[PDB]
Write a protein that binds this DNA or RNA. Sequence first.
DNA 1: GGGCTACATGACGGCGAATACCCTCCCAGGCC
Lengths: 190, 51
Amino acid sequence: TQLVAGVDAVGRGPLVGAVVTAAVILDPARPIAGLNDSKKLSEKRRLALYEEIKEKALSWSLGRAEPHEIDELNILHATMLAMQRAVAGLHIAPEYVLIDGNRCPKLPMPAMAVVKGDSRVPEISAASILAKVTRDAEMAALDIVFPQYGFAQHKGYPTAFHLEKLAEHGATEHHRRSFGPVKRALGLAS
Amino acid sequence: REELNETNSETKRKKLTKRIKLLEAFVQSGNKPEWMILTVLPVLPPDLRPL
DNA sequence: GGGCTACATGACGGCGAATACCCTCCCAGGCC
């Protein structure tokens, strides 16, 4: 109950890029504040928090899937194996794991899921902040490499802007080819 | 100006163009941003505020 | 001889910035 670790997954469904997950472990032997959630604050609010929790947590974790692997088992299998990988990556084992939702993987430690943990669990909130900042960094890198799509603007989500860009230019190797629009761009739709 | 040429949100563009208009107004004028902070406070002539 | 301490609550519209809400598609695996 003292080494409770909570993991969260952000960017589960953006058309482009792989998913990213984290798992930060923190106990009450240091000061934490301003980490209620991540989907209601500003980007700035998320830039200090990323670093704040990075140095306040004893351990920090990461994990990501691949476009082929994701499309090979959808966003219900890959997403789970990604957080399994993230838990595997933790330097120190956690006697308690938390996963936003009502579904749990096959893990050797007693993991369990809680719904809407992003606004009640500071752990899951911090993990979501870390994983979201890493997503934003990856999308910035891709938009630098691919400036013709505007990844850094909409974060590769299913917006009308993204739909029109994928209809005009097409899909690259990074796009998840198992979704609809992307299949409609190259003609794989039945 | 360089991030306005890349943003794609209407309200973001509006805020950016307002800020750019303010910055260009300051650049063109001889005004300085720090002049808003009053260090010397002038007073009205006594005849304009008589007793 | 001489200076100092410097509460209402009974107002209607509109417009424009500040946020809070419903667009926007796109995933699935148990219920119809």
